Design a protein around this nucleic acid. Structure first.
Ligand SMILES: Nc1ncnc2c1ncn2[C@@H]1O[C@H](CSCC[C@H](N)C(=O)O)[C@@H](O)[C@H]1O
Length: 350
DNA sequence: TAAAGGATGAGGAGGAAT
DNA sequence: ATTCCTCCTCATCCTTTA
C-alpha cells in the first residue's frame, strides 16, 4: 500500500537534508533504455500500485517542486536512472514570493502570510474576481487591516486561484510569462501561434517543472558525451526537451508524440529558435504509432537512449468532479500506451 | 465564432488532540 | 488506536460576452 514520503523530497533535493545516493532496482527494470515517467502524486487509490507494477515494480520517487521553485507541485516520478551525483541548473531559482514577485512587495498586505504558491493548474482566476476583491477592500484603505471576515474572504480566494498583488487592493492571477518562468520555460515559450490566453494556461498546467525534471536528468550528461536520442511521449510543450537543453545535453534526435497541433508547433518553434542541430520528428496520436515505425526509426538512428513522458492525469486529478475514475478513464488509460512503446524499445535495446 | 466566466465536491493528506 | 479540523487538487461543462 503506497504511502507518500513526508517530507516529499524523494531521494533528496538541493539545500535540504535527507539525501540518498544509491538504490536497488529489480534486474528487469535495468536499462537500456533509460526511461522516466511522470504523473500526479494525489491519485485515487491503487493507481500508483498499478503503475509501478507495469513499470517493472519500480517504486515511485515522490517530489514536491516546492523545493525547486516558488509554486508547489506534488508529483510522482518512476525511472531506472542512477541517483549519485545529480546537480541542478543555473541560475538558482526564486523560492519565495518575495523573491519571485519583487514588484509585488509594495502592494502585499501583511495579513497575507503566504511565502509560497499553490499548484499552477489549467484554470486561472477571472478579471471580475479581481474587482470583487477590490470593492471589498477600498472601504478599509485608511485602516491598517480589513475586518477578519473580509480577510478570510479574500485570503481564501487568493489561495484558490493563486493570486498575487499587482496594485492597490488589486489581486490578479498569474500571467503566462509568469507561469513559464515559475515552471522553468523561457518567456513566450507558448506565445507564438495566435494561442489564446485560455489555451496557454491549459498547456502550462499540464507540464513539468523543468528544474525538478532536469535535476533528475543531470546524471545523463557525463555518460552521454556525444548526445542522446529521445523518445518523448505525451510531449506537450516540451518540458523534457527544455530540461535537456538547459542541462547542455545534445539531443541528436527527438521523436515526439503529441496529439495537440499547437503544442507540436510550440516544440517546433523552440527547436528552430534554439538553433538546435539534431532532428525533430513529430507524431500526433500515440494510439496510431505502430511498432513497425518505432523499430524502423531505431534501425536508422541507432536506438533510443531515453524514453520520457507524462501520461494524462485527467481521470486521476482531484480537480476533476466528473471523471475521477482512475486508470480506467478514457484519457489516463493511455498510460498503457506508454508501456506498450517502452516494451518495443526494450525488445531491441536488450 | 472564439474566448472567458462561473458552477459543480469528493477525497485524502497532514496535523493535533486524546 | 481513535476523533476533529484545515487545507489542497496537471479539471469538466455549460453559459455568457465580445
Ligand atoms: N492520444 C494521445 N496521443 C498523444 N498525445 C496525447 C494523446 N492524448 C493526450 N495527449 C497529450 O498528452 C499531454 C498530457 S500531459 C502534458 C505533458 C506536459 N504538459 C509536458 O510538458 O510534459 C497533453 O499535452 C496532450 O496533448
Amino acid at each position: 500500500p503506497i504511502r507518500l514520503p513526508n517530507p516529499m523530497i524523494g531521494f533528496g533535493v538541493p539545500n535540504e537534508p535527507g539525501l540518498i545516493t544509491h538504490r536497488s532496482l529489480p534486474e528487469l527494470a535495468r536499462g537500456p533504455p533509460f526511461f522516466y515517467y511522470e504523473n500526479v502524486a494525489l491519485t485515487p487509490k491503487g493507481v500508483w500500485e498499478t503503475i509501478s507494477r507495469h513499470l517493472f515494480e519500480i517504486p515511485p520517487e515522490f517530489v514536491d517542486s516546492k523545493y525547486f521553485c516558488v509554486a508547489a507541485r506534488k508529483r510522482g516520478y518512476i525511472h531506472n536512472l542512477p541517483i549519485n551525483n545529480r546537480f541542478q541548473i543555473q541560475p538558482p531559482p526564486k523560492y519565495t514570493i518575495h523573491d519571485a514577485f519583487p514588484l509585488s512587495k509594495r502592494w502585499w498586505p501583511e495579513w497575507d502570510k503566504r511565502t509560497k504558491l499553490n499548484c499552477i493548474l489549467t484554470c486561472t482566476g477571472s478579471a471580475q474576481l479581481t474587482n470583487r476583491i477590490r470593492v471589498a477592500l477600498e472601504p478599509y484603505n485608511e485602516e491598517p487591516e480589513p475586518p477578519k471576515h473580509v480577510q478570510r474572504y479574500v485570503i481564501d480566494q487568493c489561495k484558490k486561484w493563486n493570486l498575487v498583488w499587482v496594485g492597490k487592493n488589486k489581486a490578479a492571477p498569474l500571467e503566462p510569462d509568469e507561469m513559464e518562468s515559475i515552471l522553468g520555460f523561457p518567456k513566450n515559450h507558448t506565445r507564438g501561434g495566435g494561442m489564446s490566453r485560455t489555451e496557454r494556461f491549459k498547456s502550462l498546467g499540464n507540464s513539468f517543472q523543468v528544474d525538478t525534471v532536469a535535476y533528475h536528468l543531470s546524471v545523463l550528461k557525463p555518460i552521454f558525451p556525444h548526445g542522446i536520442n529521445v523518445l518523448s511521449l505525451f510531449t506537450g510543450i516540451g518540458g523534457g526537451e527544455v530540461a535537456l537543453h538547459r542541462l547542455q545535453i545534445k539531443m541528436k534526435l527527438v521523436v515526439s508524440v503529441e496529439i495537440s497541433k499547437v503544442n507540436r508547433n510550440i516544440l517546433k518553434d523552440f527547436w528552430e529558435q534554439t538553433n538546435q542541430t539534431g532532428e525533430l520528428i513529430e507524431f500526433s496520436d500515440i494510439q496510431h504509432l505502430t511498432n513497425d515505425t518505432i523499430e524502423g526509426l531505431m534501425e536508422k538512428y541507432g536506438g533510443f537512449d531515453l524514453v520520457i513522458g507524462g501520461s494524462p492525469c485527467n481521470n486521476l486529478a482531484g480537480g476533476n468532479r466528473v471523471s475521477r475514475v482512475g486508470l480506467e478513464g478514457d484519457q489516463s488509460s493511455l498510460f498503457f500506451e506508454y508501456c506498450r512503446i517502452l516494451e518495443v524499445v526494450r525488445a531491441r535495446m536488450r
